[PDB]
Amino acid sequence: PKNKGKGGKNRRRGKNENESEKRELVFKEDGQEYAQVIKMLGNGRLEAMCFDGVKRLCHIRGKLRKKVWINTSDIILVGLRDYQDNKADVILKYNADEARSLKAYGELPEHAKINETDTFGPGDDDEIQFDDIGDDDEDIDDI
Amino acid sequence: MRGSHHHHHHTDPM
């Protein structure tokens, strides 16, 4: 199982069970600046410092709380002028995979260094279903 | 790899 593409001769499908999936990357917005997290706080906020060299506590968004992933070493976008400057509330979360696109985010240079990557998409993913194909392991047992 | 047709290519499903 290699080569992660889309169109060709793999997977095969065509039911159209209500379309509701599509990539949508977001870039920095006017009035809001991008930032980098250094430390994490309670939960409703996090410790971070703008690439320009400004350390401020970016509060986690409310609506985004449902789909906002913050890390101690990741890129993000926080709005300004809401806390009278100095502080900025994370408007959206800039993923690590997107980090390659960050060059496109017009925030980090081509020499910038991104942390975390994960084997395509998020990681961890606790709990598993099916888990078929194996049982007795076969082929290898002790390795 | 050995014994097929001169020289095969891509014989490992992964």
Q: A106: which DSSP letter?
A: T
In Å, what is the CA distance from A74 to each residue of A13, A56, A81, A126, A138?
Answer: 35, 15, 22, 22, 40
Backbone angle region of A44, left / alpha / beta, with phi > 0 → left and psi within -120 to 50 → alpha: alpha
Structure tokens at A73: 């070493």
- What b-and-e string marks burial along A93-115, b requiring 16 or more CB atoms within 10 Å of the CB? bbbbebbeebeebebbeeeeebe
Q: What domains are defined for chain A?
A: 1-143 (2.40.50.140)
The Cβ-side half-sphere exposure at A23, using a 13 Å CA radius, reads: 6
DSSP assignment string, A7-71: SSSSS------S-----------TTEEEEEEEEE-SSSEEEEEETTTEEEEEEPPSGGGGS----
Contact between B2 and B12 (Cβ < 8 Å): no
CA–CA gap between residue A19 and residue B11 (Å, rounded):
37
Q: Closest Cα partner for A101 from A123, A68, A75?
A: A75
